[PDB]
Amino acid sequence: THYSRKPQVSSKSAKAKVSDLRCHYKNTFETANVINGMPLRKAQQLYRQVLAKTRCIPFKRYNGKIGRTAQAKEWGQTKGRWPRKSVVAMMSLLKNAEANAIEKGLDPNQMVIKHVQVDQAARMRRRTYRAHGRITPYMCSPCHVQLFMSEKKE
Amino acid sequence: KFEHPRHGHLGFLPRKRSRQIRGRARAFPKDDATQKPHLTSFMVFKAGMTHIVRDVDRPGSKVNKKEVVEPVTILEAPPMVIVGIVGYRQTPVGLKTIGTVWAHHTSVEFRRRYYKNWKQSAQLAFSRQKQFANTKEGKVAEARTLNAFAKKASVIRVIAHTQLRKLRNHRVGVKKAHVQEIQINGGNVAAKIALAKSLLEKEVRVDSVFQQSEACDVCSVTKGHGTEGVVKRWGVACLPRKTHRGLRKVACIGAWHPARVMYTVARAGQHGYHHRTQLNKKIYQIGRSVAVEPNQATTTYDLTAKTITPMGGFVGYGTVRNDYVMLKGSVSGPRRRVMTLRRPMAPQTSRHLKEKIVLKFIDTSSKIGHGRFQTKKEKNQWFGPLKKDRIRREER
Amino acid sequence: KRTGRKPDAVSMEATIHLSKLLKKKTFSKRAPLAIKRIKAFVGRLMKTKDNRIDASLNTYIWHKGVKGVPGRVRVLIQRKSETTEGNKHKHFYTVISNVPVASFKGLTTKTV
RNA sequence: UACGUCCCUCUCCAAACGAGAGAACAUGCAUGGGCUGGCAUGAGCGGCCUUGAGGCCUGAAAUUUCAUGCUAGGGACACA
RNA sequence: UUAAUGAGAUUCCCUCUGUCCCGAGUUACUAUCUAGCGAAACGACAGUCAAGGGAACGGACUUGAAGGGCUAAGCGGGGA
RNA sequence: UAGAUGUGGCCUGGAGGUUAGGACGAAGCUUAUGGCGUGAGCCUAAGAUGGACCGGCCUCUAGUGCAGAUCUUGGUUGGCGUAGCAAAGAUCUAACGGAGACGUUGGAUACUGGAGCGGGGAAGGAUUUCGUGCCAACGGCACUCG
RNA sequence: AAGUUUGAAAAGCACUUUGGAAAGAGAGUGAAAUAGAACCUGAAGUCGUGACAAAGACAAUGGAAGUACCUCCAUUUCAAC
Numbered sequence A: 001t002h003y004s005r006k007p008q009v010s011s012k013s014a015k016a017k018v019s020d021l022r023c024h025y026k027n028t029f030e031t032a033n034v035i036n037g038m039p040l041r042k043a044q045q046l047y048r049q050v051l052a053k054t055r056c057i058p059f060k061r062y063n064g065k066i067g068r069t070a071q072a073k074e075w076g077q078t079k080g081r082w083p084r085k086s087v088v089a090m091m092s093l094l095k096n097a098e099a100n101a102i103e104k105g106l107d108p109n110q111m112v113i114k115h116v117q118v119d120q121a122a123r124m125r126r127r128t129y130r131a132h133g134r135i136t137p138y139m140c141s142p143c144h145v146q147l148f149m150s151e152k153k154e
Numbered sequence B: 001k002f003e004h005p006r007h008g009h010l011g012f013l014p015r016k017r018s019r020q021i022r023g024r025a026r027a028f029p030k031d032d033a034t035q036k037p038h039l040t041s042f043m044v045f046k047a048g049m050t051h052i053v054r055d056v057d058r059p060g061s062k063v064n065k066k067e068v069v070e071p072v073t074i075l076e077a078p079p080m081v082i083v084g085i086v087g088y089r090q091t092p093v094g095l096k097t098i099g100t101v102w103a104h105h106t107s108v109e110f111r112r113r114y115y116k117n118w119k120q121s122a123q124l125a126f127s128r129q130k131q132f133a134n135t136k137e138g139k140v141a142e143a144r145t146l147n148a149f150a151k152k153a154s155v156i157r158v159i160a161h162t163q164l165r166k167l168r169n170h171r172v173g174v175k176k177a178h179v180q181e182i183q184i185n186g187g188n189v190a191a192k193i194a195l196a197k198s199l200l201e202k203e204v205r206v207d208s209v210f211q212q213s214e215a216c217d218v219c220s221v222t223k224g225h226g227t228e229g230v231v232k233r234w235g236v237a238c239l240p241r242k243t244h245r246g247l248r249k250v251a252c253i254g255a256w257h258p259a260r261v262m263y264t265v266a267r268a269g270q271h272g273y274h275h276r277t278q279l280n281k282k283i284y285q286i287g288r289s290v291a292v293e294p295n296q297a298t299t300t301y302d303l304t305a306k307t308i309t310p311m312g313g314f315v316g317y318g319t320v321r322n323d324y325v326m327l328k329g330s331v332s333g334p335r336r337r338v339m340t341l342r343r344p345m346a347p348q349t350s351r352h353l354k355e356k357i358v359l360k361f362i363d364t365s366s367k368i369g370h371g372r373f374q375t376k377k378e379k380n381q382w383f384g385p386l387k388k389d390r391i392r393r394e395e396r
Numbered sequence C: 001k002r003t004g005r006k007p008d009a010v011s012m013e014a015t016i017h018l019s020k021l022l023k024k025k026t027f028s029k030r031a032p033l034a035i036k037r038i039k040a041f042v043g044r045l046m047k048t049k050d051n052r053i054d055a056s057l058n059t060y061i062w063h064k065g066v067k068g069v070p071g072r073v074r075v076l077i078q079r080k081s082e083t084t085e086g087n088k089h090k091h092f093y094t095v096i097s098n099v100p101v102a103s104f105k106g107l108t109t110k111t112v
Numbered sequence D: 001u002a003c004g005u006c007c008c009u010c011u012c013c014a015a016a017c018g019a020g021a022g023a024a025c026a027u028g029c030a031u032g033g034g035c036u037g038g039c040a041u042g043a044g045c046g047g048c049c050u051u052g053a054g055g056c057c058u059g060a061a062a063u064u065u066c067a068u069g070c071u072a073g074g075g076a077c078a079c080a
Numbered sequence E: 001u002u003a004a005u006g007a008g009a010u011u012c013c014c015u016c017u018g019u020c021c022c023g024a025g026u027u028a029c030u031a032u033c034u035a036g037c038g039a040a041a042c043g044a045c046a047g048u049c050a051a052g053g054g055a056a057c058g059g060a061c062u063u064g065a066a067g068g069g070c071u072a073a074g075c076g077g078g079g080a
Numbered sequence F: 001u002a003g004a005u006g007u008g009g010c011c012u013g014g015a016g017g018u019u020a021g022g023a024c025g026a027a028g029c030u031u032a033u034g035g036c037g038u039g040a041g042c043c044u045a046a047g048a049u050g051g052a053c054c055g056g057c058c059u060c061u062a063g064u065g066c067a068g069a070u071c072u073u074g075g076u077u078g079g080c081g082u083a084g085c086a087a088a089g090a091u092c093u094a095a096c097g098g099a100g101a102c103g104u105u106g107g108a109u110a111c112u113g114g115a116g117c118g119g120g121g122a123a124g125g126a127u128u129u130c131g132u133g134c135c136a137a138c139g140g141c142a143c144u145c146g
Numbered sequence G: 001a002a003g004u005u006u007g008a009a010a011a012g013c014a015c016u017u018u019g020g021a022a023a024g025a026g027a028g029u030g031a032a033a034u035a036g037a038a039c040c041u042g043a044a045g046u047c048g049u050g051a052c053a054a055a056g057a058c059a060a061u062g063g064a065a066g067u068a069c070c071u072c073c074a075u076u077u078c079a080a081c
């Protein structure tokens, strides 16, 4: 089985995945959805400026008591962050799907990020230690990231 | 049973950040049509404070006797450039503007106020109003509303802004123009536009608005302190040293009923940076500029030559270069925050508020120190050609 | 790159008044944050953020201990390169070093 | 492709973070000089006091005027 | 009844002080913001008020009065 | 309501009979798949589901129906990217390595301060030693290191 | 605790290339990879994005009764009752 949505044209499209993306589902969620209609070059340009901390990732749906910032007004909000590990982990998943656009013969300067999809993986376990001898969980919560691309005819 | 008088004043709630730093008169004085058309407000910039010595009057015990040291405030007041005229209908839902004539020219600092960048912009503000003013329909559509400001209008308010390129202060980092509507409180509104229409696009200097020995009210915005706690914001009390979870709190902020916290109990939040008014602040001197009279602070009994600017400027402000106004006492600003003067509401008929004043002494001793010297040409007299100038005034 | 590539391998010998940049800062962090606010000083001085320290500037800032820091430091800024071009490049770093001067009253910003 | 706003940088009358007040070749920033003000006579030297109210510090969470030095213009919506 | 001894109980006096009148400023460390990491207790549903009645001190009923939404920091009134 | 009773009445597992399906797709599973029974429930369709068993009826049989037991077990979830990761030593730099905050070396400033973050042992542990790799998860941050 | 019960057969993904290698995209195996070893089926719960009435919050839910629009769901007529 694959891939919640089909690109509606398979040769004019690239595809890329990760499965155990090693960091928080919740930071990776909005890191991903923030680029979900953007061109591929405008999406790396976003992430590479999130890392210089000049644009932020607008946390929707997992904002939940994160601090307010000025850099999130463009996104129509007050909240937003600069998750380094989840952004550098999709710099890589995008440059993969670049390599899938050259492999088919598609200018990546024409690729649009259609349908990113982040979800939850098997949620690794490593106990921690509470007061009074209570052994509580310390789940890691990895994530799967899907996305495919397409072109836009002139 | 036992109790105490309540902490803080409920008539300054909410303790909220003022909506702008610009001090803005909420109400202008009652329109006495028995007076002459004039301007009842003016925007100054808080330079700082100092103190003065006064020949006292008003026979009492501490008065009708030797002098007194009273702290004052120096407010630099450059002349204001009137740009518009604004009239209001007296409609049953409260005043409403019935148009606004502008001047033909509109200073480049005024037009910055309609921007927030102004240097990447194309500066189109008031472009089709300079153009359309030179037209004939412009003159029509301008006298069509001046002939309205007499039919429908009751309140007439010129729009004045500050001259800041005429305020060579740099520590006032802003180059926009502070824009303030100013009531005219003459009579016979027909003759009220006549003033407005006249002094439009002309500078209004502060002594034209105010006189020397009379008092104003100072609409201003308090010095901000951010989030201050309960003991500082309301001044309630400190709990005993023995308290757990610390002691700078209000212990009981609610009975069981009502089961909601009241708006009256003290809580922590914005303290300072509120809009206050300071009724009845009395002007002691409204002296002119050093460019025109470089003997500001030498009245009659300090026959030496000096200026208001202390030794080493006012701390954190600079030199006063413009038509300063000297009030008496406190003003709810930090340095270089715009204050708005206003002619007062109170009846003001009193032997403690209508009495005239002569200032026998003013202090220019430096704010930055303790200062023991007035008029730095006194410091040179105390010392000698010490090694700083000796290495320059003897090395030639 | 108007005033950036117009010179090649600049050298300006400029004073960095540090008591102004480290005031009431925690003493334990004062000698590290001295280094760090010379980076973002000489960065703003030459529009680049890749600033090395030539181990005599570093030895100087630390010579009075982590808490004691000199009030001023006179610095020789070398901006050598690996000669990139275009945009978003790396080949403009800085070889910030110290200058023994024994006095700071009279000396302005110099060059070469 | 418009007028514009916003981010990034800087400033600080503002500030927990937002927001605010600003500037965006400007006295802007950085040094220095001068003022103002702290301290209380500097390393060294002459004959211990003398040089000498000296030296040092002085805007920096952010005193004040003068000389010289460098001095992003890029992004994001607006925008369809 | 008692000298000595007392982290014993008690009262006064002296000294001394922020215990206080009456608080204020400073400092680390935190809280705050960020990168990384990440729990739990608890969890019917929830969740603006006043009055009424009621297992007699309601979040839901009755009748009124407010209430656009989503929010960050607090606090400790209530959620018997 | 407690209770009693009836039902040619409903349903699950299995038996004895009968009738019958199934690789031209059985059980199962999904549901804006309708219909039809007052209901329990049944039947259908359509699955870009499933792959090999099983339905109806008459009797028999029982480990036969679950929302609620501070139920039991498994799993998930909210709070929530939140509380926090705040006692105990402050890392700073070069150039070097490396896929890359990391390590190594040099220099620098430190901390332990000889009742030690020292060197040796007993008790206890038993490969934790060492080297060379390695870096998935473990070292509550990270790691090229352990 | 734990049936790895993948498939009939390991035929267990050669090889190309993006990645430092993993993993990904392709191919290829086979009846199925939507059977890829944490593998028969794959449910509930919760989540994700795509769509929508794109509705519209001023507890949720629910009752009755309509209406709006949309539904390869049933039925009926589709030269007629």
Ligand SMILES: [Mg+2]
Pocket (backbone or CB within 6 Å): B242, B243, B244
């Ligand atoms: Mg206690």
Ligand SMILES: [Mg+2]
Pocket (backbone or CB within 6 Å): none
């Ligand atoms: Mg600041």
Ligand SMILES: [Mg+2]
Pocket (backbone or CB within 6 Å): none
């Ligand atoms: Mg602003």
Ligand SMILES: [Mg+2]
Pocket (backbone or CB within 6 Å): none
């Ligand atoms: Mg200076």
Ligand SMILES: [Mg+2]
Pocket (backbone or CB within 6 Å): none
């Ligand atoms: Mg400055």
Ligand SMILES: [Mg+2]
Pocket (backbone or CB within 6 Å): none
């Ligand atoms: Mg519970």
Ligand SMILES: [Mg+2]
Pocket (backbone or CB within 6 Å): none
């Ligand atoms: Mg709130």
Ligand SMILES: [Mg+2]
Pocket (backbone or CB within 6 Å): none
């Ligand atoms: Mg809250």
Ligand SMILES: [Mg+2]
Pocket (backbone or CB within 6 Å): F013, F063
């Ligand atoms: Mg059985």
Ligand SMILES: [Mg+2]
Pocket (backbone or CB within 6 Å): F063
């Ligand atoms: Mg049973």
Ligand SMILES: [Mg+2]
Pocket (backbone or CB within 6 Å): none
């Ligand atoms: Mg159950």
Ligand SMILES: [Mg+2]
Pocket (backbone or CB within 6 Å): none
């Ligand atoms: Mg339960």
